[PDB]
Amino acid sequence: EVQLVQSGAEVKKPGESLRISCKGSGYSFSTYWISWVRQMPGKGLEWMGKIYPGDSYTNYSPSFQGQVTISADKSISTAYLQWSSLKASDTAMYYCARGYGIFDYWGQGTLVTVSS
Amino acid sequence: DPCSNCPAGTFCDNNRNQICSPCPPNSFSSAGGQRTCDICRQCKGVFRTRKECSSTSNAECDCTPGFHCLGAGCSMCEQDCKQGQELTKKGCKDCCFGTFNDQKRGICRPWTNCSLDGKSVLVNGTKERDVVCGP
Amino acid sequence: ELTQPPSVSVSPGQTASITCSGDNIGDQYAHWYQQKPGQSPVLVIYQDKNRPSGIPERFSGSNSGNTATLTISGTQAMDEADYYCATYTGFGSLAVFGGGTKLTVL
């Protein structure tokens, strides 16, 4: 079976940097896009951007451009989402998903709690 | 609970006083204790039969040639295109200039800009192949 | 931008209609995701009208003009969830989710 397994919950302070991960297994990781999706508590899904891990080509939605960095290590079939300085408003669930418009597999989500 | 006595391939109908009854043809039950036999999946159109269904296991599909699987158990089929193309609602369309696709599925993506990392272009890109960068 | 009604409520057995409006969204493929509390989203409709195998046949979809519609006939309590429309735009290579619709069943 194909699986997207994300890293565990994070508890951080504002101004801290953070990188969370999403490991794909059971398929050719380098040949499917990986999208990152934000869901603030009680709010809707928001597409942040995507990466093609074969050559690490990345692009972002305009509201997340310059706010986060998406990266990948294809030798370990892992995609990453990172912040240079978290804000309290970054508190949210973050999902990784396979695809660019059709998201046929989803990670289990990573909760990030940012509190002063 | 009596319904646990019905193994896979049978069902325990809570009507008719919970008796084990065998799954009718073209239905199945993959686990014991089920209250109904599920309808066997049918692979039609873009879907193609990979395994027929038995009394204890659902049929399995892949996609007919020209299509590729998506989702667990190949629950969805999406049309192939050729290298140098991408799928749109209107059909397969050639990649835009400056972009490429080296697969029979997915979307086009831009050529690597070598200059941004102090690199030069060794091989120009095509609609099927990325630009090759050198030192 | 894809706009959905924040709430749709029905009684069991009634038809639930969830719209997702956007300018010329009928020119794109619309996909529909279902999300239950505490779970990851699950795709219930793809390419405006196609249903993945395993999704109850009471789920259907359409897309035309400036509106895509997810329809649940004979809605059941197990269908209570948040529903999100999504499209991909090649002009910019962006994916866009609608704001979401919370479906409540009496």
Q: A95 pairs with which residues across the strands?
A: A37
Contact C16, C72 (CB under 8 A): yes
The rounded distance, in Å, linking the Cα atoms of A30 and A49 is: 17
What are the boundaries of each domain within chain C?
Answer: 1-106
The rounded distance, in Å, linking the Cα atoms of C95 and C97 is: 7
Residue type at B125? G
The secondary element (H helix, E strand) that includes residue B85 is strand B85-88
Tokens of A19: 């990188």
Top-level class of domain B64-135: mainly beta
Of A61, A59, A115, A62, nearest in space to A90 by CA:
A115
Please enumerate in sequence order all residues whose Cβ is within 8 A of that of B16, keeping only pairs 6 or more positions apart, or say none.
none
Q: Position of tokens 């279902």?
A: C34
Contact C96, C13 (CB under 8 A): no
Nominal resolution (angstroms): 2.0
Cβ within 8 Å, pair C46-B76:
yes
Q: Which of A40, A60, A106, A111 to mutate to test the interface with C (most CBs of C within 10 A)?
A: A106
The rounded distance, in Å, linking the Cα atoms of C85 and C4 is: 8
Which residue ranges does chain B devote to CATH 2.10.50.10? Answer: 64-135
The rounded distance, in Å, linking the Cα atoms of A23 and A96 is: 9
The rounded distance, in Å, linking the Cα atoms of C4 and B1 is: 45
Tokens of B62: 């892949």
Tokens of C76: 């059941």
Instruction: Report CA dihedral (A4, C38, A64, B96) to the nearest 10 degrees.
Output: 50
CA distances to A88, B93, C63 from B1, in Å: 51, 58, 47
What are the boundaries of each domain within chain A?
Answer: 1-116
Tokens of B68: 């590729």
Cβ within 8 Å, pair C40-A35:
no
Contact B86, B108 (CB under 8 A): yes
Interface of B with C (CB under 8 A): 41, 47, 61, 70-71, 73, 75-76, 78, 86, 88-89, 107, 109
Contact A105, A22 (CB under 8 A): no
Contact B67, B78 (CB under 8 A): yes
